[PDB]
Structure formats: structure tokens, C-alpha cells
Design an enzyme around this catalytic site. Structure first.
Site, PDB file in Angstrom:
ATOM      1  N   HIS A  47       0.833  -1.174   0.328  1.00 18.63           N
ATOM      2  CA  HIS A  47       0.031  -0.307  -0.109  1.00 18.63           C
ATOM      3  C   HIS A  47       0.823   0.848   0.355  1.00 18.63           C
ATOM      4  O   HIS A  47      -0.086   2.381  -0.416  1.00 18.63           O
ATOM      5  CB  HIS A  47      -1.292  -0.150   1.233  1.00 18.63           C
ATOM      6  CG  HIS A  47      -0.628   0.362   2.668  1.00 18.63           C
ATOM      7  ND1 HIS A  47      -0.117  -0.557   3.633  1.00 18.63           N
ATOM      8  CD2 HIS A  47      -0.447   1.309   2.612  1.00 18.63           C
ATOM      9  CE1 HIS A  47       0.175   0.449   4.694  1.00 18.63           C
ATOM     10  NE2 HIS A  47      -0.203   1.423   4.168  1.00 18.63           N
ATOM     11  N   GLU A  54      18.939   7.008   8.881  1.00 17.63           N
ATOM     12  CA  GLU A  54      18.063   8.302   9.211  1.00 17.63           C
ATOM     13  C   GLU A  54      17.705   8.232  10.518  1.00 17.63           C
ATOM     14  O   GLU A  54      17.536   7.351  11.657  1.00 17.63           O
ATOM     15  CB  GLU A  54      17.183   8.727   8.430  1.00 17.63           C
ATOM     16  CG  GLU A  54      16.637   9.361   6.888  1.00 17.63           C
ATOM     17  CD  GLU A  54      17.335  10.186   7.203  1.00 17.63           C
ATOM     18  OE1 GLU A  54      17.315  11.000   8.123  1.00 17.63           O
ATOM     19  OE2 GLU A  54      16.750  10.970   6.456  1.00 17.63           O
ATOM     20  N   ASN A  98      16.505  11.898  12.533  1.00 21.10           N
ATOM     21  CA  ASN A  98      16.255  13.279  12.389  1.00 21.10           C
ATOM     22  C   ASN A  98      15.728  13.349  10.547  1.00 21.10           C
ATOM     23  O   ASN A  98      16.635  13.487   9.965  1.00 21.10           O
ATOM     24  CB  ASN A  98      16.444  14.294  12.594  1.00 21.10           C
ATOM     25  CG  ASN A  98      15.346  15.667  13.047  1.00 21.10           C
ATOM     26  OD1 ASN A  98      14.327  15.703  11.718  1.00 21.10           O
ATOM     27  ND2 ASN A  98      15.048  16.511  14.234  1.00 21.10           N
ATOM     28  N   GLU A 125      23.154   9.356   6.936  1.00 17.93           N
ATOM     29  CA  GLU A 125      22.308   8.998   5.749  1.00 17.93           C
ATOM     30  C   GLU A 125      23.025   8.567   4.831  1.00 17.93           C
ATOM     31  O   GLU A 125      24.190   8.971   4.380  1.00 17.93           O
ATOM     32  CB  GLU A 125      22.057  10.127   5.211  1.00 17.93           C
ATOM     33  CG  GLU A 125      21.152  11.049   6.497  1.00 17.93           C
ATOM     34  CD  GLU A 125      21.022  11.841   8.158  1.00 17.93           C
ATOM     35  OE1 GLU A 125      22.518  11.821   7.496  1.00 17.93           O
ATOM     36  OE2 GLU A 125      20.614  12.591   8.179  1.00 17.93           O
ATOM     37  N   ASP A 163       0.061  -7.513   1.671  1.00 22.31           N
ATOM     38  CA  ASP A 163       0.900  -6.025   1.783  1.00 22.31           C
ATOM     39  C   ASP A 163       2.203  -6.043   2.204  1.00 22.31           C
ATOM     40  O   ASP A 163       2.539  -5.503   2.974  1.00 22.31           O
ATOM     41  CB  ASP A 163      -0.175  -5.073   2.896  1.00 22.31           C
ATOM     42  CG  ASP A 163       0.010  -4.104   2.491  1.00 22.31           C
ATOM     43  OD1 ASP A 163       0.240  -3.796   1.876  1.00 22.31           O
ATOM     44  OD2 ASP A 163      -0.623  -3.356   4.046  1.00 22.31           O
ATOM     45  N   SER A 183       0.572   0.777  15.863  1.00 25.43           N
ATOM     46  CA  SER A 183       2.037   2.136  14.859  1.00 25.43           C
ATOM     47  C   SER A 183       0.226   2.668  15.092  1.00 25.43           C
ATOM     48  O   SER A 183      -0.333   3.279  15.068  1.00 25.43           O
ATOM     49  CB  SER A 183       2.046   1.311  14.087  1.00 25.43           C
ATOM     50  OG  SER A 183       1.219  -0.272  13.594  1.00 25.43           O
ATOM     51  N   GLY A 202       1.632   6.648   8.768  1.00 29.52           N
ATOM     52  CA  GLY A 202       3.452   7.227   8.676  1.00 29.52           C
ATOM     53  C   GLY A 202       4.203   5.996   8.890  1.00 29.52           C
ATOM     54  O   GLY A 202       5.221   5.994   7.885  1.00 29.52           O
ATOM     55  N   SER A 218       3.583   3.181   8.135  1.00 26.23           N
ATOM     56  CA  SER A 218       3.218   2.276   7.086  1.00 26.23           C
ATOM     57  C   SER A 218       4.689   1.823   6.331  1.00 26.23           C
ATOM     58  O   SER A 218       5.683   2.846   5.180  1.00 26.23           O
ATOM     59  CB  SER A 218       2.396   2.746   6.050  1.00 26.23           C
ATOM     60  OG  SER A 218       1.078   3.280   6.385  1.00 26.23           O
ATOM     61  N   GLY A 219       4.520   0.385   6.098  1.00 27.57           N
ATOM     62  CA  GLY A 219       5.559  -0.530   5.565  1.00 27.57           C
ATOM     63  C   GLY A 219       7.000  -0.663   6.354  1.00 27.57           C
ATOM     64  O   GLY A 219       8.181  -1.338   5.661  1.00 27.57           O
TER      65      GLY A 219
HETATM   66  N1  LIG Z   1      -1.710   0.091  13.583  1.00 29.60           N
HETATM   67  C1  LIG Z   1      -2.171   1.077  13.340  1.00 29.60           C
HETATM   68  N2  LIG Z   1      -3.502   1.001  13.885  1.00 29.60           N
HETATM   69  C2  LIG Z   1      -2.586   1.306  12.068  1.00 29.60           C
HETATM   70  C3  LIG Z   1      -1.749   1.423  11.212  1.00 29.60           C
HETATM   71  C4  LIG Z   1      -1.086   1.794   9.638  1.00 29.60           C
HETATM   72  C5  LIG Z   1      -2.462   3.222   9.199  1.00 29.60           C
HETATM   73  C6  LIG Z   1      -2.314   3.699   8.088  1.00 29.60           C
HETATM   74  N3  LIG Z   1      -2.408   4.536   7.730  1.00 29.60           N
HETATM   75  N4  LIG Z   1      -2.875   4.511   6.857  1.00 29.60           N
HETATM   76  C7  LIG Z   1      -3.377   6.241   7.038  1.00 29.60           C
HETATM   77  O1  LIG Z   1      -3.938   6.760   7.386  1.00 29.60           O
HETATM   78  C8  LIG Z   1      -3.304   6.831   4.974  1.00 29.60           C
HETATM   79  C9  LIG Z   1      -2.882   7.337   4.747  1.00 29.60           C
HETATM   80  C10 LIG Z   1      -2.699   7.124   3.136  1.00 29.60           C
HETATM   81  C11 LIG Z   1      -3.943   8.045   3.247  1.00 29.60           C
HETATM   82  N5  LIG Z   1      -4.912   8.588   3.639  1.00 29.60           N
HETATM   83  C12 LIG Z   1      -5.155   7.901   5.084  1.00 29.60           C
HETATM   84  C13 LIG Z   1      -3.757   3.022  10.237  1.00 29.60           C
HETATM   85  C14 LIG Z   1      -3.745   2.454  11.434  1.00 29.60           C
HETATM   86 CA   LIG Z   2      18.389  12.926   8.874  1.00 33.24          CA
END
Ligand SMILES: N=C(N)c1ccc(/C=N/NC(=O)c2cccnc2)cc1
Ligand SMILES: [Ca+2]
Length: 223
Positions: free
Chosen positions: A40, A52, A54, A62, A84, A172, A175, A177-178
Site C-alpha cells: 500500500h 536516518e 531526524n 544518511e 500487503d 503504530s 506514517g 506504514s511499511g
Molecule cells: N496500527 C494501526 N492502528 C494503523 C497502522 C497503519 C495505518 C495506516 N494509516 N494510513 C492512513 O490512515 C492513510 C494513509 C494515506 C491516506 N489516507 C489515510 C492505520 C492504523
Molecule cells: Ca537526517
């Protein structure tokens, strides 16, 4: 990461930031040329940022390397988030050192109760919005498949697991994500999805990496 702690600069040396003019996803370095992330997180024009802490300040450790190719899992379903997982190849090999290091793939799946480290630069608030500049960490247990399925009826596949706290407060978030879920030095999970963040009875859901080791290895071997 909500309810976590400041990791410390370069203490999570396999943690990468995916950048397309700004941080948008995490990933995990698995060898000098390859990163594992969430499908995703797919987009074109990815620059991989290693070493990384900061993400808004050049601090001295970096390595910025452009992606040469991305491979989304052949069976990724963006509606259900089943499968995913995505591989990203770097244009040039990273220089591996103490602060930029690969993470081992699992040779077996982890069990419920295993303690793991989840990390990322995602939102730190469960209600509002605040994005940290430095890497955040959370120690969390893998939850039983039955409790995971009870939390998210009809949504948990054999390629997913829950980790975190049913009481809420620690999770988590957007942001992250991944990014990695690492348990006893093995990459067992990828930050995938959830319902909000750190909500009661709504733990994070993670891609079950042990299911994909065969695909990862053979993909790397031919690309
Ligand atoms: N662990 C969790 N509770 C969790 C983990 C990851 C995510 C992912 N979120 N991404 C978004 O909301 C998103 C990303 C791009 C555009 N619009 C919304 C949520 C919950
Ligand atoms: Ca940096």
C-alpha cells in the site's frame, strides 16, 4: 507510533524512510540492495533514505539511494490489504555499517506472546495529529489469531497478525506504514493497517512476513 519512546539515533539500523519529496512510509533493509515495505506504500519516484534519525536534518549517517524498481506482491489486494508486501531495489548497494544494517528474514513464524519492536516516523497521537522528526519505537507482543479475528471480524487473513495492546494507548499509526516489526532479531511483520490508532480493542494489523520468505528470496535471486 503512539505511546512509544524515542528510539535513539541509529539504534534501529535496518529502518528506512521512503521519500518522494517528504517521508511517506517506512521500510526494512534486508540486504545491501533491497528493502521490504508494504504494497500500500507503492508509488513511483521513491528515494530510499537509510541511516536516518531526524528526517528533517542531515545529521551525518544518511545514505540516500533512489529505487531502481519496485515489485508489489503478485497477489496484493488493495481493498482487503491481503498480501500487503512490496520489494524495492536500490540503484546502488548501500554501504553497510553499524548504523546502516540489514535485518534477518525469519526461518519460522513467530508465536502469540512474542515480544517485538515496532518503529517509525508516523503520527504520535491517537486523537489529534503530531508527526515526530526523530524515530519512535514501541515494544509490543504478538496477539493470538483468535483475539485478532475477534477484534476485526471478517478481515484477518492467514497473511496477517495483530500486535499491540487490546486496552489501547500504544500502537503504530499513519506514517508508520511499511515499517518493521522485529522479534528476536527477525523481521516478522510489516506495518499494514488498523482502525484509527491506539484505540481500545483495535490493535495494529501486520503483514505476516514468514509467509513471504520464499517469494522474497526467489524474487531477489532473479532481479
Ligand atoms: N496500527 C494501526 N492502528 C494503523 C497502522 C497503519 C495505518 C495506516 N494509516 N494510513 C492512513 O490512515 C492513510 C494513509 C494515506 C491516506 N489516507 C489515510 C492505520 C492504523
Ligand atoms: Ca537526517
Amino acid at each position: 507510533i503512539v505511546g512509544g519512546y524515542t528510539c535513539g539515533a541509529n539504534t534501529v539500523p535496518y529502518q528506512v524512510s521512503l521519500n518522494s519529496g517528504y517521508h511517506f512510509c517506512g521500510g526494512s533493509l534486508i540486504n545491501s540492495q533491497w528493502v521490504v515495505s508494504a504494497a500500500h506504500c507503492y508509488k513511483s519516484g521513491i528515494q530510499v533514505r537509510l541511516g536516518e534519525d531526524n528526517i528533517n536534518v542531515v545529521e551525518g549517517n544518511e545514505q540516500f539511494i533512489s529505487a531502481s524498481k519496485s515489485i508489489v506482491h503478485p497477489s496484493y489486494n488493495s481493498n482487503t490489504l491481503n498480501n500487503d508486501i512490496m520489494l524495492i531495489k536500490l540503484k546502488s548497494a548501500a554501504s553497510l555499517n553499524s548504523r546502516v544494517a540489514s535485518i534477518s528474514l525469519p526461518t519460522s513464524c513467530a508465536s502469540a506472546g512474542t515480544q517485538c519492536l515496532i518503529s517509525g516516523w508516523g503520527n504520535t497521537k491517537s486523537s489529534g495529529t503530531s508527526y515526530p522528526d526523530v524515530l519512535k519505537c514501541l515494544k509490543a507482543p504478538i496477539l493470538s489469531d483468535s483475539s485478532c479475528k475477534s477484534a476485526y471480524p471478517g478481515q484477518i487473513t492467514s497473511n496477517m497478525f495483530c500486535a499491540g495492546y487490546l486496552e489501547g494507548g500504544k500502537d503504530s499509526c499513519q506514517g508508520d506504514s511499511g515499517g518493521p516489526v522485529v522479534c528476536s532479531g527477525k523481521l516478522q511483520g510489516i506495518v499494514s493497517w488498523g482502525s484509527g490508532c491506539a484505540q481500545k480493542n483495535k490493535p495494529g494489523v501486520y503483514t505476516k512476513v514468514c509467509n513471504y520468505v520464499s517469494w522474497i528470496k526467489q524474487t531477489i535471486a532473479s532481479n
